[PDB]
């Protein structure tokens, strides 16, 4: 077949490379050729592209594991009969274990080994399916999507439609997620993303009127559905924006298939989907991991005998065909702090892109305007038109300034008689004004001839003109040399002529002493 | 001791009730007495309040454990201690293994079991420290925020401080995310948040021109303590907005306290924390699991000797005092979605308030306007004032339409002489706009006394003056009842004078035939 793309609603379904995978419930997952998979799953994941052997190298390939017992050119030939029926297949990069750490410059050999099998098997597109240490292992986060972009280019070249698409686990796709890289660099040039919306357990989101929503939670599924959806299809909720036309949700198959997230009643998909549909945003598919469990047996070797497809193939086929949501994007558009008196730009870091992938951040305008020179908020408001279509989005600028320090402001004891500098040993900042010493005054002085404590006031006179100000204050205390009698202490005993000093004069003792304060023996007692 | 809070920064340290607990590497935490706490810790979180005995009902308690060799008034003696030196000791709610799910009406009972262990045991306060599970198990998202609104409220009957604070795993922290509801009903009874930053491992944040910075990437962490804080302080990247006086950061002590998340190297957290002051905002302190973690020892048996309060007891007390953060928070603006020519009010689920708590929702406006009656977007902008602060933040209207459906219009055959109605069966609709039936017309007729296919268009007419247009078509085709020669068939026998049907005509064989088209054989051949 040629590069076969899908233009309609998909149910999408990945096929083991590999036999008889065990449950999350004891369950079984035989090897099946691609022949029997059900016709209604029209994209067909082989899964998994990685790396076999690190010895190899870093590049990751795709080796068919013989014991499903289809040769290389009969596996050819079945993707052929998938092809001549309209459906797609696709290489799944990933899974559990994938050994995929990539380094910047590795991009180019990526590419050439994903065209190689395309070529060679007859692959419609690659699924991008990393599991999570991989998301954002050494440089994947840069390599897989430039790689791809050659890839995307390459076939657009002789006019096919190398599919793209993306099953990220849903909690990746908020708003500055591990997914972020992937979803901006690929814009315009992917089909659909599927993400996986089981195996988180817990994780969910916080809705108003209902409460916390739980993946996990069967009594919640229809809102679990609606809202997720509705979150990603709009960018609300601290999510990224997939436009509904290229939102297909992926469940399991059965309770084998994953550990959480199976949908128990279907009814709540079929509402949760119309739901989205009466607010004009139709979804484009559902995905399952996976038509092996969906062929599978459970632990008591019943067979789930299609049950899926059973509950979802009419569902999701008998529907309108996806309208393309034609809405541009912005970029790189973070609330942001500026000094007081700094030189802000308000297009530096922004950039635009049309539905497509083509760059016009030309295009970008910008409502607002932000006082570098006055303390306080400014909102902006960029904007950005394409094909009839327009978004904006705000942006907070806060002006805010910075208080100085002063240092060497320290309480000193100096000796009587020694000069003393009050600007020695201080100095005053500003990360923007830089060295403001020679901004600040003393107020009062220091007499070192005249034993004593002098109160300084140091006051920094900054900002424009200088007439904002900050004040510290020091102690100089000046001290005597000279030595005298020692204190008296309450403990020590003293002989008639022993001498001592206590509370700034010196006294003698006229007789035995032990314990009496000087000053406190009156006119005829043993202190004089 | 009275109720001790704090007004300063903060070295928070949680406290086993418990012995020898076990390290993530092999290493052991005895218990401790209180007073042989290193002083610099003047926040002590005794861990846990928590359900002992499901017996006992729902509303958690505190049983000390014996084997820690304090008897309950030795307890209490060792926290008058602390309180006389001026440190809080802080009741934590939950830990590994709570059993904490609490139904709606709970509240009353656990606020008075707080006020009694409160009073009881001398506690300043208590820390909300939810397990995963219990963040958001039955209606504690509701029942632990209204208790605590009470206790706070009882202890500023009598003019005290009850110190609130919580320590959500970072990750919950984002826009939606489960500790929402903590964080926005007791938006002004909290003192301060101190989030794990730790035992997440690979999660994080992407930012762009560094990438994807991990909490457990060790080349990376002044980055992460930089970033993430940056993040909570100004409420970007995706996270609710703790004020910077009101973050404190929480971390291991060591490599045996937690899974992932110890920092290797101080200086890290010393630069982090010197950026966010170098922009006006400085942290409000550290937290740490735990004392005993700090004086425990490695699976060496060596005593790791403090090395906590070590690294950052000095380095956060010689700190300026926190300067309070007065701005204003709105609440439940969320971009929306409205239908064509339906009613939509502005401040319909919108709610504000100060920076202490009170409802000024009375004070919010709206700049900007939005047309139901036209088809697009428009911009909306919520601003509330209050203590000379300012917030604003931005809603973006998207108003829509839906198509109408038709329903009976499918290609139908009728016999000869029949009645035919042709808007038997047929209607439209439109979800605001209801039965539609009326306003179809119908182009061509059937005349069903002739044989023949007929071809009718269906037009609806809906909108404002029926001015909007959709078309389906349909073909009635009427076929006689009239019984006729069999047709011919390439694989029958036939004789002299059998006659058959074939292309629109009867024939009648002249001879033997098997295999000759009738038409087919000329002026003298079989078939006349
Ligand atoms: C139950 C089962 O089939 N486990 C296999 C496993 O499946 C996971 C898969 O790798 C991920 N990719 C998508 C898409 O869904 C994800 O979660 C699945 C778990 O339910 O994959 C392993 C190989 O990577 C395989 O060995 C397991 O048998
Ligand atoms: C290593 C260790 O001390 N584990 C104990 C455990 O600690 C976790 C704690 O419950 C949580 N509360 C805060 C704050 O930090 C959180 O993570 C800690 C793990 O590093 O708590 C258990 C009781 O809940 C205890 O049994 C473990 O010994
Ligand atoms: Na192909
Ligand atoms: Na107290």
Same mark, same amino acid.
């Not at 049309?354 to 932000?370: E, F, H, L, M």
């Not at 907070?396 to 000193?412: N, Q, S, W």
């Not at 001592?500 to 314990?515: L, R, Y």
């Given at each position: 077949?040629?590069?076969?793309?899908?233009?309609?609603?998909?149910?999408?379904?990945?096929?083991?490379?590999?036999?008889?995978?065990?449950?999350?419930?004891?369950?079984?997952?035989?090897?099946?050729?691609?022949?029997?998979?059900?016709?209604?799953?029209?994209?067909?994941?082989?899964?998994?592209?990685?790396?076999?052997?690190?010895?190899?190298?870093?590049?990751?390939?795709?080796?068919?594991?013989?014991?499903?017992?289809?040769?290389?050119?009969?596996?050819?030939?079945?993707?052929?009969?998938?092809?001549?029926?309209?459906?797609?297949?696709?290489?799944?990069?990933?899974?559990?274990?994938?050994?995929?750490?990539?380094?910047?410059?590795?991009?180019?050999?990526?590419?050439?080994?994903?065209?190689?099998?395309?070529?060679?098997?007859?692959?419609?597109?690659?699924?991008?399916?990393?599991?999570?240490?991989?998301?954002?292992?050494?440089?994947?986060?840069?390599?897989?999507?430039?790689?791809?972009?050659?890839?995307?280019?390459?076939?657009?070249?002789?006019?096919?439609?190398?599919?793209?698409?993306?099953?990220?686990?849903?909690?990746?796709?908020?708003?500055?997620?591990?997914?972020?890289?992937?979803?901006?660099?690929?814009?315009?040039?992917?089909?659909?993303?599927?993400?996986?919306?089981?195996?988180?357990?817990?994780?969910?989101?916080?809705?108003?009127?209902?409460?916390?929503?739980?993946?996990?939670?069967?009594?919640?599924?229809?809102?679990?559905?609606?809202?997720?959806?509705?979150?990603?299809?709009?960018?609300?909720?601290?999510?990224?924006?997939?436009?509904?036309?290229?939102?297909?949700?992926?469940?399991?198959?059965?309770?084998?298939?994953?550990?959480?997230?199976?949908?128990?009643?279907?009814?709540?998909?079929?509402?949760?989907?119309?739901?989205?549909?009466?607010?004009?945003?139709?979804?484009?598919?559902?995905?399952?991991?996976?038509?092996?469990?969906?062929?599978?047996?459970?632990?008591?070797?019943?067979?789930?005998?299609?049950?899926?497809?059973?509950?979802?193939?009419?569902?999701?086929?008998?529907?309108?065909?996806?309208?393309?949501?034609?809405?541009?994007?912005?970029?790189?558009?973070?609330?942001?702090?500026?000094?007081?008196?700094?030189?802000?730009?308000?297009?530096?870091?922004?950039?635009?892109?049309?539905?497509?992938?083509? /760059?016009?951040? #030309?295009?970008? &305008?910008?409502? %607002?305007? @932000?006082?570098? !020179?006055?303390? $306080?908020? +400014?909102?902006? =408001? *960029?904007?950005?038109?394409?094909?009839?279509?327009?978004?904006?989005?705000?942006?907070?600028?806060?002006?805010?300034?910075?208080?100085?320090?002063?240092?060497?402001?320290?309480?000193?004891?100096?000796?009587?008689?020694?000069?003393?500098?009050?600007?020695?040993?201080?100095?005053?900042?500003?990360?923007?004004?830089? /060295?403001?010493? #020679?901004?600040? &005054?003393?107020? %009062?002085? @220091?007499?070192? !001839?005249?034993? $004593?404590? +002098?109160?300084? =006031? *140091?006051?920094?006179?900054?900002?424009?003109?200088?007439?904002?100000?900050?004040?510290?204050?020091?102690?100089?205390?000046?001290?005597?040399?000279?030595?005298?009698?020692?204190?008296?202490?309450?403990?020590?005993?003293?002989?008639?002529?022993?001498?001592?000093?206590?509370?700034?004069?010196?006294?003698?003792?006229?007789?035995?002493?032990?314990?009496?304060?000087?000053?406190?023996?009156?006119?005829?007692?043993?202190?004089?």
């Amino acid at each position: 077949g040629t590069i076969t793309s899908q233009d309609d609603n998909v149910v999408v379904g990945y096929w083991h490379n590999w036999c008889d995978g065990r449950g999350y419930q004891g369950g079984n997952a035989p090897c099946v050729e691609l022949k029997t998979v059900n016709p209604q799953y029209n994209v067909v994941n082989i899964s998994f592209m990685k790396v076999y052997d690190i010895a190899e190298g870093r590049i990751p390939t795709f080796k068919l594991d013989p014991t499903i017992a289809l040769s290389e050119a009969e596996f050819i030939a079945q993707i052929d009969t998938l092809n001549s029926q309209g459906r797609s297949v696709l290489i799944a990069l990933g899974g559990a274990d994938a050994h995929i750490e990539l380094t910047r410059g590795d991009e180019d050999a990526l590419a050439a080994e994903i065209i190689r099998l395309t070529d060679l098997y007859g692959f419609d597109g690659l699924d991008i399916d990393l599991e999570q240490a991989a998301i954002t292992a050494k440089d994947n986060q840069f390599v897989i999507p430039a790689a791809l972009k050659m890839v995307k280019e390459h076939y657009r070249k002789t006019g096919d439609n190398f599919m793209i698409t993306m099953a990220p686990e849903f909690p990746y796709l908020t708003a500055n997620g591990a997914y972020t890289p992937y979803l901006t660099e690929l814009d315009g040039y992917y089909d659909f993303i599927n993400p996986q919306f089981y195996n988180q357990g817990g994780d969910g989101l916080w809705i108003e009127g209902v409460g916390w929503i739980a993946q996990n939670n069967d009594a919640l599924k229809e809102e679990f559905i609606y809202y997720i959806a509705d979150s990603l299809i709009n960018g609300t909720r601290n999510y990224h924006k997939i436009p509904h036309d290229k939102l297909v949700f992926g469940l399991p198959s059965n309770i084998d298939a994953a550990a959480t997230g199976y949908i128990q009643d279907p009814q709540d998909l079929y509402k949760a989907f119309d739901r989205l549909k009466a607010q004009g945003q139709p979804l484009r598919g559902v995905m399952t991991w996976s038509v092996n469990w969906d062929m599978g047996t459970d632990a008591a070797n019943n067979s789930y005998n299609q049950q899926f497809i059973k509950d979802y193939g009419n569902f999701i086929h008998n529907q309108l065909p996806p309208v393309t949501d034609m809405t541009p994007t912005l970029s790189g558009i973070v609330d942001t702090r500026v000094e007081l008196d700094s030189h802000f730009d308000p297009l530096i870091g922004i950039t635009a892109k049309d539905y497509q992938g083509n /760059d016009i951040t #030309a295009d970008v &305008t910008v409502s %607002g305007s @932000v006082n570098t !020179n006055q303390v $306080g908020d +400014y909102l902006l =408001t *960029y904007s950005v038109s394409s094909d009839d279509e327009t978004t904006n989005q705000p942006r907070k600028i806060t002006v805010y300034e910075i208080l100085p320090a002063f240092t060497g402001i320290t309480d000193t004891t100096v000796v009587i008689d020694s000069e003393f500098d009050p600007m020695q040993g201080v100095s005053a900042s500003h990360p923007t004004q830089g /060295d403001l010493t #020679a901004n600040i &005054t003393v107020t %009062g002085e @220091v007499d070192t !001839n005249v034993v $004593g404590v +002098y109160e300084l =006031t *140091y006051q920094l006179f900054y900002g424009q003109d200088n007439q904002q100000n900050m004040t510290d204050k020091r102690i100089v205390t000046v001290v005597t040399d000279a030595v005298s009698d020692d204190d008296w202490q309450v403990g020590s005993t003293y002989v008639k002529d022993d001498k001592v000093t206590h509370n700034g004069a010196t006294w003698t003792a006229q007789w035995w002493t032990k314990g009496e304060e000087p000053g406190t023996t009156g006119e005829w007692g043993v202190w004089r």
